[PDB]
Amino acid sequence: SVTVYAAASLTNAINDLEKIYEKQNKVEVKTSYAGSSTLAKQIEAGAPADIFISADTQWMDYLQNKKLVAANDRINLLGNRLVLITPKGQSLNIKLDKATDPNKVFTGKICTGDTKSVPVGKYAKQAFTNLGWWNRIEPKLVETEDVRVALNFVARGECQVGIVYATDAAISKDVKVAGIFPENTHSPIIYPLGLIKKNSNSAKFYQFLQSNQAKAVFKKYGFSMLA
Numbered sequence: 431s432v433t434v435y436a437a438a439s440l441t442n443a444i445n446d447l448e449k450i451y452e453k454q455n456k457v458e459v460k461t462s463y464a465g466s467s468t469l470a471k472q473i474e475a476g477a478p479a480d481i482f483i484s485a486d487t488q489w490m491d492y493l494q495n496k497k498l499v500a501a502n503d504r505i506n507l508l509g510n511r512l513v514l515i516t517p518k519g520q521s522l523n524i525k526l527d528k529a530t531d532p533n534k535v536f537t538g539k540i541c542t543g544d545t546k547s548v549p550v551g552k553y554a555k556q557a558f559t560n561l562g563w564w565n566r567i568e569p570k571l572v573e574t575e576d577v578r579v580a581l582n583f584v585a586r587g588e589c590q591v592g593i594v595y596a597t598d599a600a601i602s603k604d605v606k607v608a609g610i611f612p613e614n615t616h617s618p619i620i621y622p623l624g625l626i627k628k629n630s631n632s633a634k635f636y637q638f639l640q641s642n643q644a645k646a647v648f649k650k651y652g653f654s655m656l657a
């Protein structure tokens with residue numbers, strides 16, 4: 431058996447790859463999805479994850495500083511982009527530029543991950559700060575513990591705007607993209623892949639996630655493959 435803990439934005443891609451791997455090997459693949467913060471803290475407390483995939487560098491560094499992953503047992507696997515979303519049927523087009531006034535374009539709540547801890551929220555806070563929007567954005571926030579909880583709040587029309595990854599917008603027919611954050615507003619969205627337990631089965635799955643077969647699945651869902 432191999433246990434994989436993965437950022438919630440990876441739910442669909444990793445589910446697809448788990449089914450492929452189980453058809454190709456006599457191995458059971460157990461998956462757990464949540465915010466990268468929650469998952470890293472659980473591993474620190476002893477959760478038996480063999481493999482961890484974070485939605486940012488920071489939560490993998492968090493484990494490395496605790497000696498739970500070695501520098502040579504992690505690789506930058508995927509990239510993403512940050513987007514604004516709206517419920518389908520309440521479409522908007524908003525330019526993520528300092529010239530835009532967030533008090534004019536955001537007239538309800540803004541749903542995203544917790545800006546202190548969840549990767550999507552940390553990237554969002556970087557962008558708001560870069561744009562000079564933070565003190566006008568913060569009073570509007572509804573914060574969740576992973577990006578998919580935020581996606582669902584917007585999909586159900588419970589929040590007028592959300593901030594999710596491009597791949598999250600693509601997976602939900604119930605939300606539309608209202609704007610794409612320029613890359614220079616935040617740190618690059620990078621997913622490090624980490625081998626936490628070093629054994630035969632875990633090493634094989636860690637290599638499989640880097641394989642040509644896995645590339646096709648990640649690209650299908652809209653992730654970029656990192657060089």
Ligand code: MOO
Nearest residue numbers: 437439466550577
């Ligand atoms: O760790 Mo996430 O994929 O930003 O919820």
